[PDB]
Amino acid sequence: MVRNVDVKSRIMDQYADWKGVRYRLGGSTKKGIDSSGFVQRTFREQFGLELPRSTYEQQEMGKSVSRSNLRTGDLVLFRAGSTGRHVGIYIGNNQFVHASTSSGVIISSMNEPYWKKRYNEARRVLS
């Protein structure tokens, strides 16, 4: 559907500009960024939607979405890492973009064992 193709294209536009930027806690620039930071930054610049700064605040925005109802643009939240939460952006086909600790800004599959075991919730913040 054209709605989801346009939304994905804009997220990947952001991804393409940020791929490889290293993980840094509390960072918000191309010198280094964390998971909530990359999300807040993407939605601000690509969709004009202001999200709060941290994972726990973003987990409250919008409307909860069940794992089987995931749509492109939804936030995906995992009980992962030392802050206790990790957030990415679903992009279809069981994939999401995020500021990974191990690799910086990357695309990952929700079916990778590490992320699968720690899945916590989805939030829809566009609609």
N, CA, C and O atoms as a MOPAC input file, in Angstrom:
PM7 MOZYME 1SCF
protein

 N      0.84200 1    -1.18900 1     0.00000 1
 C      0.00000 1     0.00000 1     0.00000 1
 C      0.88500 1     1.24900 1     0.00000 1
 O      1.94400 1     1.26000 1     0.62700 1
 N      0.45100 1     2.30100 1    -0.70100 1
 C      1.29800 1     3.48100 1    -0.86700 1
 C      1.59700 1     4.16400 1     0.46400 1
 O      2.65100 1     4.78200 1     0.61400 1
 N      0.68700 1     4.06400 1     1.43300 1
 C      0.93600 1     4.66000 1     2.74100 1
 C      2.20000 1     4.07500 1     3.36000 1
 O      3.07600 1     4.81600 1     3.80600 1
 N      2.29500 1     2.75500 1     3.38600 1
 C      3.43100 1     2.11500 1     4.02700 1
 C      4.72100 1     2.25800 1     3.21800 1
 O      5.79800 1     2.34600 1     3.80700 1
 N      4.64100 1     2.28500 1     1.88300 1
 C      5.84900 1     2.47800 1     1.08000 1
 C      6.45100 1     3.86000 1     1.33200 1
 O      7.66700 1     3.98300 1     1.48200 1
 N      5.61200 1     4.90500 1     1.38000 1
 C      6.13100 1     6.24400 1     1.66500 1
 C      6.73500 1     6.33100 1     3.06400 1
 O      7.80300 1     6.91700 1     3.24000 1
 N      6.06300 1     5.75300 1     4.05800 1
 C      6.56300 1     5.81400 1     5.43300 1
 C      7.89300 1     5.07100 1     5.55600 1
 O      8.82900 1     5.57600 1     6.17700 1
 N      7.98300 1     3.87300 1     4.96900 1
 C      9.24400 1     3.13300 1     4.99200 1
 C     10.34600 1     3.90400 1     4.27700 1
 O     11.46500 1     3.99600 1     4.78000 1
 N     10.03600 1     4.45800 1     3.10300 1
 C     11.05300 1     5.18300 1     2.35300 1
 C     11.64600 1     6.31000 1     3.18300 1
 O     12.84400 1     6.57800 1     3.09200 1
 N     10.82300 1     6.97500 1     3.99400 1
 C     11.34500 1     8.10300 1     4.76000 1
 C     12.21900 1     7.61900 1     5.91300 1
 O     13.23400 1     8.24200 1     6.22600 1
 N     11.83100 1     6.51100 1     6.54600 1
 C     12.64900 1     5.92000 1     7.60300 1
 C     13.99300 1     5.47200 1     7.04500 1
 O     15.02900 1     5.67100 1     7.67800 1
 N     13.97700 1     4.86600 1     5.85700 1
 C     15.21800 1     4.38000 1     5.27000 1
 C     16.08200 1     5.53400 1     4.77900 1
 O     17.30900 1     5.43000 1     4.77000 1
 N     15.45200 1     6.63500 1     4.37000 1
 C     16.19300 1     7.86200 1     4.11700 1
 C     17.00200 1     8.26200 1     5.34800 1
 O     18.17600 1     8.61400 1     5.23200 1
 N     16.37800 1     8.21000 1     6.53000 1
 C     17.10300 1     8.53000 1     7.75800 1
 C     18.17700 1     7.48700 1     8.02900 1
 O     19.32300 1     7.83200 1     8.31700 1
 N     17.81000 1     6.21100 1     7.93700 1
 C     18.78500 1     5.14300 1     8.11500 1
 C     19.99000 1     5.34300 1     7.21700 1
 O     21.12800 1     5.26900 1     7.67900 1
 N     19.75000 1     5.59700 1     5.92400 1
 C     20.87200 1     5.71700 1     5.00400 1
 C     21.80500 1     6.82600 1     5.44800 1
 O     23.02100 1     6.71000 1     5.29700 1
 N     21.25100 1     7.90200 1     5.99400 1
 C     22.09200 1     9.00000 1     6.43900 1
 C     22.81800 1     8.70400 1     7.74900 1
 O     23.78600 1     9.39300 1     8.07200 1
 N     22.38000 1     7.69700 1     8.51600 1
 C     22.93100 1     7.44400 1     9.84800 1
 C     23.59200 1     6.08200 1    10.00500 1
 O     24.07400 1     5.76300 1    11.09200 1
 N     23.63000 1     5.26300 1     8.94500 1
 C     24.12000 1     3.89300 1     9.06400 1
 C     25.54200 1     3.87800 1     9.60500 1
 O     26.41600 1     4.58700 1     9.10700 1
 N     25.76000 1     3.06200 1    10.62900 1
 C     27.06500 1     2.89700 1    11.21300 1
 C     27.38900 1     3.84100 1    12.34900 1
 O     28.30700 1     3.56500 1    13.12200 1
 N     26.66600 1     4.95700 1    12.48200 1
 C     26.88100 1     5.85500 1    13.61600 1
 C     26.86200 1     5.04000 1    14.90000 1
 O     25.91300 1     4.29900 1    15.15800 1
 N     27.91600 1     5.18000 1    15.70700 1
 C     28.16900 1     4.28800 1    16.83400 1
 C     27.21400 1     4.56000 1    17.99000 1
 O     26.66800 1     5.65500 1    18.12100 1
 N     27.02500 1     3.54200 1    18.82200 1
 C     26.16700 1     3.68000 1    19.98700 1
 C     26.89800 1     4.45600 1    21.07300 1
 O     28.04200 1     4.15000 1    21.40600 1
 N     26.22400 1     5.46500 1    21.62100 1
 C     26.71100 1     6.22800 1    22.75800 1
 C     25.52300 1     6.56000 1    23.64000 1
 O     24.54000 1     7.13200 1    23.16900 1
 N     25.60200 1     6.20600 1    24.92200 1
 C     24.51700 1     6.51000 1    25.84400 1
 C     24.40300 1     8.01700 1    26.03000 1
 O     25.39100 1     8.69500 1    26.31500 1
 N     23.18600 1     8.53500 1    25.86500 1
 C     22.94400 1     9.95400 1    25.99500 1
 C     23.37900 1    10.77700 1    24.80800 1
 O     23.26200 1    12.00200 1    24.84400 1
 N     23.88100 1    10.14800 1    23.74700 1
 C     24.26400 1    10.89400 1    22.57200 1
 C     23.09000 1    11.14100 1    21.65000 1
 O     22.10200 1    10.40600 1    21.66300 1
 N     23.21300 1    12.19800 1    20.83700 1
 C     22.11600 1    12.58500 1    19.96400 1
 C     22.62400 1    13.18000 1    18.66100 1
 O     21.92200 1    13.97200 1    18.03200 1
 N     23.83400 1    12.81300 1    18.24400 1
 C     24.46300 1    13.37600 1    17.06100 1
 C     25.13300 1    12.25700 1    16.28200 1
 O     25.13300 1    11.10200 1    16.70800 1
 N     25.70500 1    12.61100 1    15.13500 1
 C     26.41600 1    11.59500 1    14.37100 1
 C     27.75100 1    11.21200 1    15.00200 1
 O     28.38200 1    10.26200 1    14.54000 1
 N     28.20900 1    11.91900 1    16.04700 1
 C     29.34400 1    11.41000 1    16.81800 1
 C     28.98300 1    10.17900 1    17.63400 1
 O     29.87700 1     9.49400 1    18.13200 1
 N     27.69500 1     9.87900 1    17.78500 1
 C     27.22900 1     8.75700 1    18.57900 1
 C     25.82100 1     9.01100 1    19.08400 1
 O     25.49900 1    10.13200 1    19.47800 1
 N     24.97100 1     7.98100 1    19.07900 1
 C     23.56300 1     8.14900 1    19.42700 1
 C     23.08400 1     6.87800 1    20.11400 1
 O     23.59200 1     5.79100 1    19.84100 1
 N     22.09700 1     7.01400 1    21.01300 1
 C     21.46800 1     5.84300 1    21.61300 1
 C     20.12800 1     5.53800 1    20.93900 1
 O     19.71800 1     6.21800 1    19.99800 1
 N     19.45800 1     4.49700 1    21.44500 1
 C     18.31600 1     3.93100 1    20.73500 1
 C     17.12700 1     4.88400 1    20.74400 1
 O     16.53400 1     5.14500 1    19.69700 1
 N     16.77100 1     5.40800 1    21.92400 1
 C     15.71200 1     6.40800 1    22.01200 1
 C     16.09300 1     7.68100 1    21.26800 1
 O     15.24000 1     8.30900 1    20.64000 1
 N     17.36700 1     8.06900 1    21.33100 1
 C     17.79800 1     9.25800 1    20.61200 1
 C     17.60900 1     9.13500 1    19.11100 1
 O     17.07300 1    10.04300 1    18.47500 1
 N     18.04800 1     8.01100 1    18.53500 1
 C     17.88200 1     7.83400 1    17.09500 1
 C     16.40600 1     7.85000 1    16.70200 1
 O     16.05200 1     8.38400 1    15.65100 1
 N     15.54200 1     7.26800 1    17.54100 1
 C     14.10900 1     7.24400 1    17.25000 1
 C     13.53400 1     8.65300 1    17.29300 1
 O     12.90600 1     9.09800 1    16.33200 1
 N     13.74800 1     9.36300 1    18.41300 1
 C     13.27500 1    10.74200 1    18.52900 1
 C     13.75400 1    11.58100 1    17.35600 1
 O     12.98900 1    12.36400 1    16.79200 1
 N     15.02000 1    11.41700 1    16.98700 1
 C     15.59500 1    12.20200 1    15.90700 1
 C     14.92100 1    11.88800 1    14.57700 1
 O     14.64800 1    12.79800 1    13.79500 1
 N     14.65000 1    10.61100 1    14.31100 1
 C     14.06100 1    10.23800 1    13.02500 1
 C     12.65400 1    10.79400 1    12.88200 1
 O     12.33100 1    11.41700 1    11.87100 1
 N     11.81400 1    10.57300 1    13.88600 1
 C     10.43400 1    11.02600 1    13.78400 1
 C     10.34000 1    12.54300 1    13.71000 1
 O      9.46700 1    13.06900 1    13.02000 1
 N     11.22300 1    13.26000 1    14.41100 1
 C     11.22100 1    14.71800 1    14.30600 1
 C     11.51700 1    15.16500 1    12.87900 1
 O     10.79600 1    15.99500 1    12.32400 1
 N     12.57600 1    14.61800 1    12.28400 1
 C     13.07700 1    15.12700 1    11.01100 1
 C     12.31400 1    14.57200 1     9.81600 1
 O     12.22500 1    15.23400 1     8.78200 1
 N     11.76600 1    13.37200 1     9.94000 1
 C     11.11300 1    12.72200 1     8.81700 1
 C      9.60500 1    12.88800 1     8.83100 1
 O      8.97700 1    12.87600 1     7.77200 1
 N      9.00300 1    13.04500 1    10.01400 1
 C      7.55400 1    13.08400 1    10.10600 1
 C      7.02500 1    14.26200 1    10.91200 1
 O      5.81400 1    14.36700 1    11.10600 1
 N      7.89500 1    15.15300 1    11.38700 1
 C      7.46200 1    16.30300 1    12.15800 1
 C      6.68000 1    15.91700 1    13.39500 1
 O      5.74100 1    16.61400 1    13.77800 1
 N      7.05700 1    14.80900 1    14.02800 1
 C      6.39000 1    14.29700 1    15.22100 1
 C      7.40100 1    14.27900 1    16.36000 1
 O      8.40800 1    13.57500 1    16.28900 1
 N      7.13200 1    15.05800 1    17.41600 1
 C      8.06600 1    15.23600 1    18.52700 1
 C      7.81800 1    14.14700 1    19.56100 1
 O      6.75400 1    14.09300 1    20.17700 1
 N      8.79600 1    13.29400 1    19.74200 1
 C      8.75400 1    12.24600 1    20.73100 1
 C      9.61100 1    12.63200 1    21.91900 1
 O     10.55300 1    13.40900 1    21.76300 1
 N      9.31300 1    12.11300 1    23.10600 1
 C     10.16100 1    12.40000 1    24.27400 1
 C     11.50000 1    11.68800 1    24.14600 1
 O     11.70800 1    10.87700 1    23.24400 1
 N     12.40400 1    12.01000 1    25.07000 1
 C     13.81700 1    11.71600 1    24.86400 1
 C     14.17500 1    10.25400 1    25.12000 1
 O     15.02900 1     9.70700 1    24.42200 1
 N     13.54300 1     9.60800 1    26.10300 1
 C     14.00900 1     8.33000 1    26.62500 1
 C     13.05500 1     7.18800 1    26.27700 1
 O     11.88900 1     7.40600 1    25.94900 1
 N     13.58300 1     5.96300 1    26.35800 1
 C     12.79600 1     4.78800 1    25.99500 1
 C     11.52900 1     4.68400 1    26.83500 1
 O     10.45400 1     4.41000 1    26.30100 1
 N     11.64300 1     4.90000 1    28.14800 1
 C     10.48500 1     4.71600 1    29.01900 1
 C      9.40300 1     5.74000 1    28.72300 1
 O      8.21900 1     5.45000 1    28.89700 1
 N      9.78600 1     6.93500 1    28.27900 1
 C      8.76900 1     7.91100 1    27.91600 1
 C      8.11700 1     7.54000 1    26.59100 1
 O      6.89800 1     7.64200 1    26.45200 1
 N      8.91900 1     7.10900 1    25.61300 1
 C      8.37100 1     6.73100 1    24.31100 1
 C      7.43000 1     5.53600 1    24.41900 1
 O      6.42200 1     5.47900 1    23.71500 1
 N      7.75000 1     4.57900 1    25.29400 1
 C      6.89600 1     3.42000 1    25.52500 1
 C      5.48400 1     3.80200 1    25.96200 1
 O      4.59800 1     2.94800 1    25.97700 1
 N      5.25700 1     5.06500 1    26.31600 1
 C      3.94200 1     5.52700 1    26.72800 1
 C      3.22800 1     6.31300 1    25.65000 1
 O      2.01300 1     6.49400 1    25.72900 1
 N      3.95100 1     6.78700 1    24.64200 1
 C      3.32200 1     7.54200 1    23.57600 1
 C      2.42900 1     6.62800 1    22.73600 1
 O      2.59500 1     5.40900 1    22.72200 1
 N      1.48100 1     7.25100 1    22.03900 1
 C      0.66400 1     6.55500 1    21.08300 1
 C     -0.18300 1     5.46500 1    21.70800 1
 O     -0.62500 1     5.56900 1    22.85200 1
 N     -0.39800 1     4.41200 1    20.92300 1
 C     -1.30100 1     3.32000 1    21.25200 1
 C     -0.53500 1     2.00700 1    21.19000 1
 O      0.19100 1     1.74900 1    20.23000 1
 N     -0.69800 1     1.17900 1    22.21500 1
 C     -0.07900 1    -0.13800 1    22.20300 1
 C     -0.56600 1    -0.93300 1    20.99500 1
 O     -1.68900 1    -0.74800 1    20.52600 1
 N      0.29300 1    -1.81600 1    20.50000 1
 C      0.00600 1    -2.64100 1    19.33100 1
 C      0.52800 1    -4.03900 1    19.62000 1
 O      1.65000 1    -4.20200 1    20.10000 1
 N     -0.28300 1    -5.04500 1    19.32800 1
 C      0.14900 1    -6.41200 1    19.56000 1
 C      1.17500 1    -6.84200 1    18.51100 1
 O      1.19800 1    -6.32200 1    17.39500 1
 N      2.02400 1    -7.80200 1    18.89300 1
 C      3.10600 1    -8.26000 1    18.02000 1
 C      2.59400 1    -8.65500 1    16.63700 1
 O      3.28100 1    -8.43500 1    15.64000 1
 N      1.39500 1    -9.23700 1    16.56500 1
 C      0.85200 1    -9.68100 1    15.28600 1
 C      0.18100 1    -8.56700 1    14.50600 1
 O     -0.26500 1    -8.80100 1    13.38200 1
 N      0.09100 1    -7.36200 1    15.05900 1
 C     -0.51300 1    -6.24000 1    14.35400 1
 C      0.52000 1    -5.19300 1    13.98000 1
 O      0.16000 1    -4.06100 1    13.65600 1
 N      1.80000 1    -5.55200 1    14.01800 1
 C      2.84600 1    -4.56700 1    13.78100 1
 C      2.72500 1    -3.99300 1    12.37900 1
 O      2.52500 1    -4.72300 1    11.40800 1
 N      2.85000 1    -2.67700 1    12.28700 1
 C      2.81200 1    -1.94600 1    11.03600 1
 C      4.08500 1    -1.11200 1    10.93400 1
 O      4.65600 1    -0.70300 1    11.94500 1
 N      4.52300 1    -0.86400 1     9.69700 1
 C      5.66100 1     0.01300 1     9.45800 1
 C      5.48200 1     1.34400 1    10.17700 1
 O      4.39600 1     1.92500 1    10.17000 1
 N      6.55700 1     1.81900 1    10.79700 1
 C      6.53200 1     3.03700 1    11.55900 1
 C      6.24000 1     2.86700 1    13.03700 1
 O      6.48700 1     3.79100 1    13.81200 1
 N      5.72000 1     1.71300 1    13.46100 1
 C      5.52500 1     1.46100 1    14.88400 1
 C      6.86600 1     1.39500 1    15.61600 1
 O      7.86300 1     0.93300 1    15.06100 1
 N      6.87900 1     1.85900 1    16.86000 1
 C      8.04900 1     1.63400 1    17.70000 1
 C      8.03300 1     0.20500 1    18.22100 1
 O      6.97400 1    -0.33000 1    18.55000 1
 N      9.20500 1    -0.40900 1    18.29400 1
 C      9.34600 1    -1.71800 1    18.91600 1
 C     10.27100 1    -1.56600 1    20.10700 1
 O     11.30800 1    -0.90800 1    20.02300 1
 N      9.88900 1    -2.18100 1    21.21900 1
 C     10.55600 1    -1.98400 1    22.49800 1
 C     10.97300 1    -3.33200 1    23.06500 1
 O     10.19700 1    -4.28700 1    23.05100 1
 N     12.18700 1    -3.40300 1    23.55800 1
 C     12.73600 1    -4.65000 1    24.06500 1
 C     13.26300 1    -4.40700 1    25.46100 1
 O     13.77300 1    -3.32900 1    25.76700 1
 N     13.13900 1    -5.41500 1    26.30600 1
 C     13.75500 1    -5.37100 1    27.62100 1
 C     15.21300 1    -5.77500 1    27.39600 1
 O     15.55900 1    -6.95100 1    27.50500 1
 N     16.06200 1    -4.79600 1    27.08300 1
 C     17.41500 1    -5.10300 1    26.63200 1
 C     18.37100 1    -3.97200 1    26.97600 1
 O     18.01600 1    -2.79700 1    26.88500 1
 N     19.59000 1    -4.33500 1    27.37300 1
 C     20.62300 1    -3.35900 1    27.64200 1
 C     20.57400 1    -2.80800 1    29.05900 1
 O     19.66400 1    -3.10100 1    29.83400 1
 N     21.58900 1    -1.99700 1    29.37500 1
 C     21.83000 1    -1.60300 1    30.76000 1
 C     20.84900 1    -0.55500 1    31.26400 1
 O     20.66900 1    -0.43000 1    32.47500 1
 N     20.20200 1     0.21100 1    30.37200 1
 C     19.15100 1     1.09900 1    30.84800 1
 C     17.84700 1     0.35700 1    31.09400 1
 O     16.92400 1     0.91900 1    31.68300 1
 N     17.75300 1    -0.89500 1    30.65600 1
 C     16.56400 1    -1.68500 1    30.84700 1
 C     15.57000 1    -1.64100 1    29.70800 1
 O     14.64700 1    -2.45500 1    29.68400 1
 N     15.71600 1    -0.71800 1    28.75400 1
 C     14.87800 1    -0.71800 1    27.55800 1
 C     15.69700 1    -0.36100 1    26.32200 1
 O     16.69400 1     0.35700 1    26.39900 1
 N     15.24600 1    -0.88300 1    25.18000 1
 C     15.82600 1    -0.61200 1    23.87300 1
 C     14.68200 1    -0.44000 1    22.88400 1
 O     13.71500 1    -1.20100 1    22.92200 1
 N     14.77700 1     0.55600 1    21.99500 1
 C     13.67900 1     0.87600 1    21.08200 1
 C     14.17900 1     0.96700 1    19.63700 1
 O     15.26700 1     1.48000 1    19.37600 1
 N     13.36900 1     0.46400 1    18.71200 1
 C     13.63300 1     0.60900 1    17.29100 1
 C     12.36100 1     0.97800 1    16.54700 1
 O     11.31300 1     1.21600 1    17.14700 1
 N     12.47800 1     1.02000 1    15.21500 1
 C     11.37100 1     1.37300 1    14.33600 1
 C     11.11800 1     0.22200 1    13.36900 1
 O     11.98200 1    -0.12300 1    12.56300 1
 N      9.92600 1    -0.36800 1    13.45400 1
 C      9.54500 1    -1.46200 1    12.56900 1
 C      9.42900 1    -0.98400 1    11.12500 1
 O      8.90500 1     0.09700 1    10.85700 1
 N      9.92700 1    -1.80500 1    10.19700 1
 C     10.00100 1    -1.38900 1     8.80300 1
 C      9.47200 1    -2.47000 1     7.86900 1
 O      9.77200 1    -2.45700 1     6.67500 1
 N      8.69100 1    -3.40100 1     8.39900 1
 C      8.12200 1    -4.46800 1     7.60400 1
 C      9.02400 1    -5.68700 1     7.53800 1
 O     10.23000 1    -5.60500 1     7.77400 1
 N      8.41100 1    -6.82400 1     7.21100 1
 C      9.14300 1    -8.07600 1     7.00600 1
 C      9.98400 1    -8.45100 1     8.22400 1
 O     11.10800 1    -8.93400 1     8.08300 1
 N      9.43600 1    -8.22600 1     9.42000 1
 C     10.07900 1    -8.63400 1    10.67100 1
 C     11.41400 1    -7.94200 1    10.89500 1
 O     12.28300 1    -8.48700 1    11.57600 1
 N     11.59400 1    -6.74900 1    10.33200 1
 C     12.83100 1    -6.00500 1    10.50000 1
 C     12.57000 1    -4.68500 1    11.21400 1
 O     11.45200 1    -4.16800 1    11.21200 1
 N     13.62400 1    -4.15100 1    11.82300 1
 C     13.56600 1    -2.82700 1    12.43200 1
 C     14.93300 1    -2.17000 1    12.32400 1
 O     15.95400 1    -2.84700 1    12.19900 1
 N     14.94200 1    -0.83700 1    12.37400 1
 C     16.16800 1    -0.04200 1    12.42800 1
 C     16.30700 1     0.50900 1    13.84200 1
 O     15.30900 1     0.84400 1    14.48100 1
 N     17.54000 1     0.60400 1    14.33100 1
 C     17.81500 1     1.06300 1    15.68900 1
 C     19.29900 1     1.36400 1    15.81500 1
 O     20.11100 1     0.96600 1    14.97900 1
 N     19.63000 1     2.08000 1    16.88500 1
 C     21.00400 1     2.26300 1    17.34600 1
 C     21.36100 1     1.05900 1    18.20900 1
 O     21.15100 1     1.07100 1    19.42200 1
 N     21.90200 1     0.02300 1    17.57800 1
 C     22.37300 1    -1.15200 1    18.30700 1
 C     23.62600 1    -0.82400 1    19.10500 1
 O     24.45500 1    -0.02400 1    18.67100 1
 N     23.76100 1    -1.45000 1    20.28100 1
 C     25.01700 1    -1.30500 1    21.01300 1
 C     26.16700 1    -1.90400 1    20.21300 1
 O     27.22100 1    -1.28300 1    20.07900 1
 N     25.96800 1    -3.10900 1    19.68200 1
 C     27.10100 1    -3.85100 1    19.13100 1
 C     27.58600 1    -3.27600 1    17.81100 1
 O     28.75600 1    -3.44500 1    17.46800 1
 N     26.71900 1    -2.59900 1    17.05700 1
 C     27.07800 1    -2.24700 1    15.69000 1
 C     26.66300 1    -0.83700 1    15.28800 1
 O     26.76800 1    -0.49500 1    14.11100 1
 N     26.19800 1    -0.00700 1    16.21300 1
 C     25.69700 1     1.25500 1    15.71100 1
 C     24.36300 1     1.10000 1    14.98800 1
 O     23.66600 1     0.09600 1    15.13400 1
 N     24.03000 1     2.12600 1    14.20200 1
 C     22.73800 1     2.15100 1    13.52500 1
 C     22.72000 1     1.06800 1    12.45600 1
 O     23.52800 1     1.09500 1    11.52800 1
 N     21.79700 1     0.11100 1    12.58600 1
 C     21.74700 1    -1.05700 1    11.71500 1
 C     20.30100 1    -1.47600 1    11.55500 1
 O     19.42600 1    -1.05500 1    12.31200 1
 N     20.06600 1    -2.31200 1    10.55700 1
 C     18.83400 1    -3.06700 1    10.38000 1
 C     19.01600 1    -4.42900 1    11.03400 1
 O     20.06700 1    -5.05300 1    10.89200 1
 N     17.99700 1    -4.89200 1    11.74900 1
 C     18.04600 1    -6.18300 1    12.41400 1
 C     16.70100 1    -6.85800 1    12.25600 1
 O     15.68300 1    -6.20600 1    12.02200 1
 N     16.71100 1    -8.17800 1    12.38700 1
 C     15.48200 1    -8.95300 1    12.32300 1
 C     14.92600 1    -9.20700 1    13.71900 1
 O     15.67200 1    -9.49700 1    14.65500 1
 N     13.60400 1    -9.09500 1    13.84500 1
 C     12.95700 1    -9.43100 1    15.10600 1
 C     13.10600 1   -10.89900 1    15.46000 1
 O     12.85900 1   -11.27600 1    16.60600 1
 N     13.50200 1   -11.73900 1    14.51300 1
 C     13.62500 1   -13.16400 1    14.78200 1
 C     15.02400 1   -13.56400 1    15.23000 1
 O     15.24700 1   -14.73000 1    15.55700 1
 N     15.97100 1   -12.63400 1    15.25400 1
 C     17.26700 1   -12.91500 1    15.85300 1
 C     17.07600 1   -13.31000 1    17.31500 1
 O     16.34900 1   -12.62500 1    18.03500 1
 N     17.70700 1   -14.39500 1    17.77900 1
 C     17.39900 1   -14.91100 1    19.12500 1
 C     17.47700 1   -13.87400 1    20.22100 1
 O     16.62700 1   -13.86000 1    21.11100 1
 N     18.47900 1   -12.99900 1    20.18300 1
 C     18.63300 1   -12.04400 1    21.26900 1
 C     17.41700 1   -11.12300 1    21.35700 1
 O     16.85500 1   -10.93900 1    22.43700 1
 N     17.00800 1   -10.54200 1    20.22600 1
 C     15.88200 1    -9.61000 1    20.23900 1
 C     14.55500 1   -10.32600 1    20.43600 1
 O     13.64900 1    -9.77700 1    21.06400 1
 N     14.41900 1   -11.54600 1    19.90900 1
 C     13.17800 1   -12.30300 1    20.07200 1
 C     12.85900 1   -12.54200 1    21.54900 1
 O     11.72800 1   -12.31700 1    21.98100 1
 N     13.84800 1   -12.99700 1    22.32700 1
 C     13.61300 1   -13.33200 1    23.72800 1
 C     13.26900 1   -12.11200 1    24.57900 1
 O     12.66000 1   -12.26300 1    25.63800 1
 N     13.64400 1   -10.90600 1    24.14600 1
 C     13.49900 1    -9.70600 1    24.96200 1
 C     12.39600 1    -8.77800 1    24.48400 1
 O     12.19900 1    -7.71500 1    25.07300 1
 N     11.66900 1    -9.14700 1    23.43300 1
 C     10.58600 1    -8.31100 1    22.94700 1
 C      9.64900 1    -7.93900 1    24.09200 1
 O      9.34000 1    -8.76900 1    24.94600 1
 N      9.20700 1    -6.70400 1    24.10200 1
 C      8.35300 1    -6.26500 1    25.19900 1
 C      7.03000 1    -5.67400 1    24.74500 1
 O      5.99500 1    -5.97000 1    25.34200 1
 N      7.03200 1    -4.84700 1    23.70400 1
 C      5.82000 1    -4.14400 1    23.30600 1
 C      6.06100 1    -3.42200 1    21.99200 1
 O      7.20000 1    -3.17300 1    21.59600 1
 N      4.96600 1    -3.09500 1    21.32800 1
 C      4.94500 1    -2.17300 1    20.20900 1
 C      4.12300 1    -0.94500 1    20.57700 1
 O      3.19200 1    -1.03300 1    21.37800 1
 N      4.46900 1     0.20300 1    19.98900 1
 C      3.63400 1     1.39700 1    20.07300 1
 C      3.46200 1     1.98200 1    18.67700 1
 O      4.43300 1     2.11300 1    17.93300 1
 N      2.22900 1     2.33400 1    18.32200 1
 C      1.95500 1     3.08300 1    17.10200 1
 C      1.83100 1     4.56100 1    17.47100 1
 O      0.95000 1     4.94300 1    18.24100 1
 N      2.71200 1     5.38100 1    16.92000 1
 C      2.72100 1     6.81700 1    17.22500 1
 C      2.36900 1     7.68000 1    16.02500 1
 O      2.26900 1     8.89700 1    16.17600 1
 N      2.17500 1     7.11000 1    14.83400 1
 C      1.74400 1     7.89000 1    13.68200 1
 C      0.22300 1     8.00600 1    13.60000 1
 O     -0.29700 1     9.06500 1    13.25100 1
 N     -0.49100 1     6.92900 1    13.91800 1
 C     -1.93300 1     6.85600 1    13.69300 1
 C     -2.67100 1     6.44500 1    14.96400 1
 O     -3.89600 1     6.33300 1    14.95800 1

